[PDB]
Amino acid sequence: YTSAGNVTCWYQTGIVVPAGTPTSCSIMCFVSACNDFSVRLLKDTPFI
Amino acid sequence: YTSAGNVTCWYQTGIVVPAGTPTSCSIMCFVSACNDFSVRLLKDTPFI
Amino acid sequence: SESSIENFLCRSACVYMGEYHTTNTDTSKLFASWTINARRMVQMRRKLELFTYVRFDMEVTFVITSKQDQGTQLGQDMPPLTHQIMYIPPGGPIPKSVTDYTWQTSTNPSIFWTEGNAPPRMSIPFISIGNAYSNFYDGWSHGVYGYNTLNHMGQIYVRHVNGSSPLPMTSTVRMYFKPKHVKVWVPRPPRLCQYKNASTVNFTPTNITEKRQSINYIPETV
Amino acid sequence: RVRSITLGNSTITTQESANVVVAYGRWPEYLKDNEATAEDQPTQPDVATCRFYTLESVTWERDSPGWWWKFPDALKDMGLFGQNMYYHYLGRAGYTIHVQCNASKFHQGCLMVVCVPEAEMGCSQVDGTVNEHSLSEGETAKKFASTSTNGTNTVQSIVTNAGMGVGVGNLTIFPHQWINLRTNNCATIVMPYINNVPMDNMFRHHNFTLMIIPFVPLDYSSDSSTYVPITVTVAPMCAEYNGLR
Amino acid sequence: RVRSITLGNSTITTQESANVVVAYGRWPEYLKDNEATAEDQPTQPDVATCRFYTLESVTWERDSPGWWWKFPDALKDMGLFGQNMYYHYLGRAGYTIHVQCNASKFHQGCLMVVCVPEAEMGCSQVDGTVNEHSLSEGETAKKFASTSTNGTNTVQSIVTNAGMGVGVGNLTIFPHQWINLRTNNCATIVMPYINNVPMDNMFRHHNFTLMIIPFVPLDYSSDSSTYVPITVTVAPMCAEYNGLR
Amino acid sequence: RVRSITLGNSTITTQESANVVVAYGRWPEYLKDNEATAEDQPTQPDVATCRFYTLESVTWERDSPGWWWKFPDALKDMGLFGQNMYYHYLGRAGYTIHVQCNASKFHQGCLMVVCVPEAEMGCSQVDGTVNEHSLSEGETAKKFASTSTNGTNTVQSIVTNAGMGVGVGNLTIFPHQWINLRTNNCATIVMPYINNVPMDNMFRHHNFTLMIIPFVPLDYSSDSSTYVPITVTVAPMCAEYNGLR
């Protein structure tokens, strides 16, 4: 109900550690725009 | 009661290890002279 | 091209609306006044806070409308009304009555206008002994936190230009403000919380964003 | 692959594989000569202002929200650079900031290190005003909190809003560096002098704020050390004051 | 030192320090023009056959004998390349296979990854015949066993004889790669099209077989993860079919 | 980044990133021709003296004071080089010594490896004399002690005085190498022939002494191996004897 692309991530193997290291961990995502970005029709923002 | 410079060392963070490594550890100091060293008035040593 | 600085900031807006009478028994209702800053217009404030330093000229247009008070007396035949719009630079005399001497000082620029004509308009340059204005100040006034005196931009005052013993009338002024020839320095993150008052950055803690169902949830595709 | 750097009578050691952020592309420099030629003559110390000053280390534990310092006046007791703050009526300077960690390959965590100009902060009471002590304590760091604070005259220091009313994930707009215990442990930021006037008084204005914020908390297991130390070292650059003669 | 590769609307990330085996020295290519000039005209899709297809990961535990896949028909449900298998009567293609592991420096183990042409397999009953389901299950892997198997119509899958009646230490005669958790975790094999005719039908013949076999089992200690994931990614190269007009 | 070295019918493997100490700047060489032209003609074996000889490994545990060997006669049972010690009345040679460790990244410790010319040792009794067995046992190492020793005819082997009456922190005046388990595990020392005469008899004189001394003891934790092995390999260089004809 979007008509947009999507991204997903899957466990291929699983995480393997030696003795004496933390068990769980984390991933972080960063987003940005590439040089070819364009905008039109200045309007008012819906946040204030 | 010296009139000499001094050197000191401080813990900025603390030591962090994984699971299964020794906890304590050691530092070693080495001393030497640089090329511009000069000496005068040979005398007798106070050790024997 | 529409994301340039000029096209993003150089746009007109109503920032103050005020009312004033020709006769009254309060004597502060006989004139209208406004201090120029860009912190009591919430939509312009937020667009201006994306930068730390700004430099611009100001353009101000005035829309003025009058009315006879519903008190009692009819059958009048009146000529059109005249108004005086005075700008005070930083470091100028401020009037306290409508009969004061400061409405005649030679260094306060002033506009005289009569109804029926095109709306009046004046243009103010960049007025600061500093090199830019600042939207954020991490300091003390000399003591108020966050307030520096280089941001003074002046004031506007409006009155009627009648003679003695005038007839009762009520006027409304709307001021439209527009910055021009704009330059900005040091971008900042956008304001995430609602504004609380006009002089501080005070806020109540806010959520980072809204929730969804789970970290895997993607809505069904049409 | 280790470099040894000496400024004055100070010496520190870094790795030659360092990465350096020059804040907006601009290196520090003197206001050249003739903004205010006639009766505004400056002077420069260049004696023991160009030297490494090292603060006390901070201790990164499992629940650490973060730390911040104000510049200057984090150096108002630091030898000569602090003496010059009292003798002179106006000044200016740029800085070089080194941040280092001491950790093992069995630890994990992630830090943001950011330098924020004009970091004006909000009060814990919406109709209140902030105190001077709650904004800084000099060479001792202030602490962020993990929940929203109370009490009079205190900065509202919940870490997700960074005391400024923005989203903390967006502070990457400022000069910043990431420290991921997995891949590096050091960060250098070179800051120039940024103001809307050429000089200023150094006691009632905070030019910029250094913040250090963990985004992934420290984790360790069985008998590793339970903390990690962080160390901050500052060298002032191209400092300049009003002439006294 | 990380490369990012995009084929079509797919993107994966590898390390630029990869090592690549080109099977017998031969890169894939089109049968040029004129083996069968007159009424044998081919066509090529080159649309969404050249794109990365990623299967499900497999789980390497302490007692894992191994895994195998058949090519093609491991891709008979994979988007367009699978559609072309039903629309066209004859085809051909080469492949690029990436195999990756996710493990730590506290794990240990060793894998062989080998691509075997014409891997004809034996039955668990000497006077029996193998079933079609026991040879492959498509994009799901079959499993080797650690002892000798029974039951009707099943491949005899004891891992020391690799289902072919040879010694498993001698499979290095085929295009192969070693994965030693100590030194690397990835393997790329580029396979050309190998047959005794130029084209063929893709449903009743298995061109080659991909096998993954642990020679030193996975070992870990106190509170590491108890498994390691393996991931396989395939990109078809220079695919070509019989013309339909 | 591994080199494979063959001397004669011997082969060992080292890392190409090795560091080599040439003792006083001098490589080994033959006494050229004409110190003693007329009736002093030498000969050289160059057969199976130039070859790697490997002793037994020693075991580094938590409380190990150290080890020492005497040269020559650590090689008096080593094949041909040892045969030549009995057949010839005078000789000379230089040496290449490799020392290696086998340890993990979860161990820690530090070793000094030093080659000392004329290492004359003291007796445990001040008015006593040292025995021949207490100075060496051939290819088996002698051991230092952690406290002061007793008994007749024994070397006084407290490790802080190194059996010579000096401070052990000052042995860096000799050709030496450090092995820090954190950064390397190997050491090569090339020793020339050093005497106050050109040749000498090889049975009643010890040219030099190899010592290995831990300055930071071995440490490990929960279920690592409780010892670390050290291995010593020696290749004689430019050996030369009196002619027999």
Is D196 close to C134, i.e. CB distance below 8 A? yes
Angle at D66 between CA D64 and CA D67, to 5 degrees: 130
Q: Show the tokens assigned to D57.
A: 């280390």
Question: Are D92 and D193 a contacting pair, CB within 8 Å?
Answer: yes
Q: List, as one string, the DSSP characters of E203-244.
A: SS---EEEEEEEEEEEE--TTS-S-EEEEEEEEEEEEEEE--
Q: How many CA atoms lie within 13 A of D182 on its CB side?
A: 14
Residue that the structure tokens 């985004």 belong to: D215
CA dist C138 and D72 (Å) reads: 12
Cα–Cα nearest to C115, from C160, C178, C165, C77: C160
D10-14/D3-7 β-pairing: antiparallel
Q: Who's near C209: CB < 8 A, 6+ residues apart?
A: none
**Contact across the interface for B26 and F216, Cβ inside 8 Å:** yes
> SS3 for C116-127, per residue?
CCCCCEEEECCC
Among the partner-chain residues D106, D223, D225, the one whose CB lies closest to the CB of B14 is D225
Q: Which domain holds residue E44?
A: 1-245
Residue F145 CA to residue F164 CA, distance in Å, equals 14
Q: Judge whether D185 is closer than 8 Å to chain B, CB to CB.
A: no
DSSP reduced 3-state for D110: strand
Type of residue at C32: A
| Six-digit token string for D209 | 């704020």
From CA D27, how far away is CA D41, in angstroms rounded? Answer: 23
CB A2 within 8 A of CB C214: no
**Bridge partners, residue D94, by sequence:** D237
Q: How many domains does chain F have?
A: 1
B/e letters for F137-170, b = 16+ CB within 10 Å, e = fewer, are eebebbebeeeeeeeeebbbbbbeebbbeeebee
Cα D142 to Cα D163: distance, rounded to the nearest angstrom? 12
Q: Which two tokens stand for residue E91?
A: 């085809």
Measure D91 CA to nearest chain C CA, in Å: 15
Give yes or no for B18 touching D (CB within 8 A).
yes
B46 Cβ under 8 Å from any chain E Cβ = no
Residue with tokens 């202002």: D49
E79: left (phi over 0), alpha (psi -120 to 50) or beta: left
State the Cα–Cα distance between residues B37 and B35, nearest whole angstrom.
6
Judge whether F234 and F96 are in contact, CB under 8 Å: yes
- Please, how many CA atoms are within 13 Å of residue D126, restricted to the half-sphere of its CB? 10
Residues of D in contact with F222 (CB under 8 A): 222-223
Q: Which one-letter amino acid corresponds to residue F2?
A: V
The C-alpha R_g of chain D, in whole angstroms, comes to: 19
Q: Does C42 touch chain D (CB under 8 A)?
A: no
Question: CB-based burial of residue F217 (10 Å sphere; 0-12 exposed, 13-18 middle, 19+ buried)?
Answer: middle
Residue numbers in A near E60 (CB within 8 A): 13-14
The number of angstroms, rounded, from the C-alpha of F229 to the middle of its chain's C-alpha atoms is 17
Distances (CA, A) of C8 to A33, A47, C131: 19, 17, 22
- Provide the 3-class DSSP secondary structure of residue D202: coil
For D47, E171, E198, the CA distances from E27, given in Å and listed in that order, are 68, 22, 16
Q: Take residue D237 and report the two structure tokens written for it.
A: 């650059």
Let me know if F93 is exposed, middle or buried by CB neighbors in 10 A (0-12, 13-18, 19+).
Answer: buried
- Joined tokens for residue F178: 């450090």
First CA to last CA distance, chain C? 34
Contact (Cβ atoms closer than 8 angstroms) between residue C52 and residue C135: yes
DSSP D85: H
Q: Which residues pair with F140 in a beta bridge?
A: F137
User: Which contiguous run of DSSP H or E holds residue E85?
Assistant: helix E79-87
State how beta strands C170-187 and C13-21 pair.
Answer: antiparallel
Nearest to F214 by CA among F105, F77, F108: F108
Q: Are residues C105 and C93 in contact, defined by beta-carbon separation less than 8 angstroms? A: yes
* β-strand pairing of F176-180 with F67-71: unpaired
Task: Convert D47-64 to b/e letters by CB count within 10 Å (16 or more is b).
Answer: ebbbbbbebebbebeeeb
Both tokens of residue D70?
A: 């104000």
Within 8 A by CB and 6+ apart from C56, the residues are: C9, C126, C133, C179, C180, C181, C182, C183
Nearest in space to C20 (alpha carbons), one of C116, C156, C120, C117: C156
Residues of A in contact with B20 (CB under 8 A): 18-21
Give the distance, in angstroms, between the CA of residue D157 and the centroid of all CA atoms in the same chain.
Answer: 17
**Breaks in chain C, named by the residue before each, with C–N above 2.5 Å?**
142
Instruction: Name the nearest CA neighbour of D210 among D94, D114, D133.
Output: D114
Kindly state the tokens that stand for A38: 């364009």
The closest CB to that of D104, out of B11, B12, B15, belongs to B15
Number of domains in chain C: 1
- Is any Cβ of chain E less than 8 angstroms from the Cβ of A23? yes
3-state secondary structure B3-39: CCCCCCCCCCCCCCCCCCCCCCCCCCCCCCCCCCCCC
Tell me if A18 and E59 make a contact (CB, 8 A cut-off).
no
Contact A2 C222 (CB under 8 A): yes
- Rounded to whole angstroms, the Cα distance separating B22 from F182 reads 13
Q: How far apart are the first and last CA of chain D?
A: 48
User: From CA D99, how far away is CA D170, in angstroms rounded?
Assistant: 21
**Which residues lie below 8 Å from residue A7, measured CB to CB, with a gap of 6+?**
none
As a residue count, chain B comes to: 48
- Sign of the dihedral through C-alpha D192, D197, D200, D205: negative
**C131 CB burial (10 A radius; 0-12, 13-18, 19+):** middle
- Can you tell me the distance from the alpha carbon of D194 to that of D89, in angstroms, rounded to the nearest whole number? 18
Per-residue tokens: F122: 């003291």
Distance, CA of E31 to CA of F169 (rounded, Å): 75
Rounded to 5 degrees, φ, ψ at C44 are -70, -35
CA neighbor of E73 nearest in space, from E172, E156, E142: E142
Residue of F nearest to B24 (CA): F219
Cβ–Cβ contact F221 with A under 8 A: yes
Tallying the residues shown for chain E, one arrives at 245
The distance of Cα C25 from the centroid of its chain, to the nearest Å, equals 27
Helices (H), chain F: 79-87
HSE at residue F132, side-chain half, CA atoms within 13 A, is 6
**CA gap F4, F11 in Å, rounded:** 7
Closest-CA residue to F239 (of F127, F78, F101): F78
φ, ψ of residue D136 to 5 degrees: the values are -155, 160
DSSP assignment of F61-126 equals -SS---EEEEETTSSTTSHHHHHHHHH-S-EEEEEEEEEEE---TT-EEEEEEEEEES----BSST
Rounded CA separation C158/C111 (Å): 10
**Structure token pair of residue A35:** 């040089």
Q: Cα–Cα distance between F112 and F35 in angstroms, integer?
A: 37
Structure's resolution in angstroms: 3.2
| Parent domain of C109 | 1-222
Q: Which chains touch E (3 or more CB pairs under 8 A)?
A: A, B, D, F
d(CA C195, CA C135): 14
For residue D72, report the phi and psi dihedrals to the nearest 5 degrees: -85, -160
Q: Which residue has the tokens 């069904």?
A: C220
The Cα–Cα gap between E184 and B24 comes to 32
- CA distances, D43 to each of D7, D71, D83, D237, D242 (Å): 20, 21, 15, 14, 6
Q: Do chains B and C touch (3 or more CB pairs under 8 A)?
A: no
Residue F111 identity? L
- End-to-end distance of chain E based on CA atoms, in angstroms? 48
- Rounded Cα distance between C49 and C203, Å, is 15
The phi, psi pair for E53, rounded to 5°, reads -110, 130
Q: Tell me whether C70 touches chain A (CB under 8 Å).
A: no
D133 in Cβ contact with D142 (< 8 Å): no
Question: What are the backbone angles phi and psi of residue C10, rounded to the nearest 5°?
Answer: -80, 85
Taking the C-alpha atoms of residue D85 and residue D88, their distance in angstroms, rounded to an integer, is 6
Tokens read off for F174: 């000799």
Chain D (112-131) residues lying within 8 Å, Cβ to Cβ, of chain C: 117-123, 125-130
Q: For the CA atoms of chain E, what is the radius of gyration? A: 19
Q: Is C57 helix (H, G, I), strand (E, B) or coil?
A: strand
> Are C200 and C147 a contacting pair, CB within 8 Å?
no
Q: What angle do CA D225, D231, D234 make, to 5 degrees?
A: 175
The whole-angstrom separation of Cα B23 and Cα A45 is 56
Report chain B's terminal Cα–Cα distance, integer Å: 27
- Residue whose token pair is 């499992």: D62
Q: What is the Cα–Cα distance from F166 to F211, expressed in whole angstroms?
A: 14
Nearest to A20 among D108, D215, D221 (CB): D221
- For C199, D117, D175, the CA distances from D178, given in Å and listed in that order, are 34, 18, 11
Give the integer Cα–Cα distance in Å for E124 and E68.
Answer: 17
Closest partner residue to D228 (CB to CB) among B16, B18, B19 is: B16
**Strand (E) or helix (H) holding C62:** strand C51-67
- Read off the tokens for C184: 């900005």
Cα angle, residue D168 at apex, residues D167 and D173 outer, rounded to 5°: 95
C133-134 and C51-67 beta bridge pairing: antiparallel
Residues F23 and F192: beta-carbon distance below 8 Å: yes
Cβ proximity of D74 and D203 under 8 Å: no
Task: Determine if the peptide bond prior to C93 is cis (ω within 30°).
Answer: no
**Which pair of tokens denotes residue A31?**
């987003």
Sort out which chain A residues have CB atoms less than 8 A from D221's CB and list them.
Answer: 20-23
Contact residues on chain B for E222, CB-CB shorter than 8 A: 19-20
Q: How many angstroms separate the CA atoms of C154 and E236, rounded?
A: 72
The Cα C201–Cα E191 span in angstroms is 64
Answer yes or no: are the C-beta atoms of C18 and C170 closer than 8 Å.
Answer: no
Coil, strand or helix at E155: strand
Amino acid residing at D7: L
Task: List all residues of chain A from 1 to 48 with a beta carbon under 8 Å from chain C.
Answer: 1-3, 6, 8, 39-42, 44-45, 48
For residue D99 the two structure tokens come to 């941040």
Q: List Cβ<8 Å contacts ≥24 apart for D201-204.
A: D201/D89, D201/D90, D201/D91, D202/D72, D202/D73, D202/D85, D202/D90, D202/D91, D203/D73, D203/D85, D204/C139, D204/C140, D204/C142, D204/C143
Chains E and C touch (3+ CB pairs under 8 A): no
Nearest residue of A to residue C219 by CA position?
A: A1
- Integer CA distances (angstroms), F164 to C44, D40, F116, in order: 86, 73, 11
Q: Give the whole-angstrom CA distance, residue F78 versus residue F93.
A: 15
Rg (chain F; Cα; Å): 19
- How many other C-beta atoms lie within 10 A of the C-beta of residue C207? 10
Give contacts of A45 with chain C, Cβ < 8 Å. 43, 46
β-bridge partners, F208 = F71, F117
Q: How far does A20 lie from chain F, in Å, by closest CA?
A: 9
Which DSSP state fits A19?
T
Alpha-carbon torsion (E115, E120, E123, E126), positive or negative: negative
What CA–CA distance (Å, rounded) separates F90 from F204? 11
**In this structure, what token pair is assigned to residue A40?**
């039109």
Separation between Cα atoms, residue D141 and residue E165, nearest integer Å: 72
Cα(D145)–Cα(D160) distance, integer angstroms: 9
For residue A3, the chain C residues in CB contact (below 8 A) are: 221-222
Q: How far is CA C173 from its chain centroid? A: 12
Helices (H) and strands (E) in chain E, counts: 1, 14
Checking phi first, is residue C116 left (phi over 0); if not, alpha (psi -120 to 50) or beta?
left
Backbone dihedral angles phi then psi of residue E12, each to the nearest 5 degrees: -130, 170
F215: nearest Cα among F45, F60, F26: F60
Which residues partner with E211 through β-bridges?
A: E68, E114
F222 touches chain B (CB under 8 A): yes
Q: Is E83 exposed, middle or buried (0-12, 13-18, 19+ CB in 10 A)?
A: middle
Q: Are C85 and C149 in contact (CB under 8 A)?
A: no
Q: Which residues of A touch B18 (CB under 8 A)?
A: 18, 20-22
CA gap E19, E16 in Å, rounded: 9
> Do the beta carbons of residue D204 and residue F202 sit within 8 Å?
no
Residues 88-127 of E with CB under 8 A from B: 106
Q: Is B48 on the interface with A (CB under 8 A)?
A: no
Return the SS3 of D82: helix
Q: Residue D154 and residue D156: Cα distance in Å, rounded?
A: 6
Residues in chain B within 8 Å Cβ distance of F223: 20
**Nearest chain F Cα distance for residue A47, angstroms:** 54
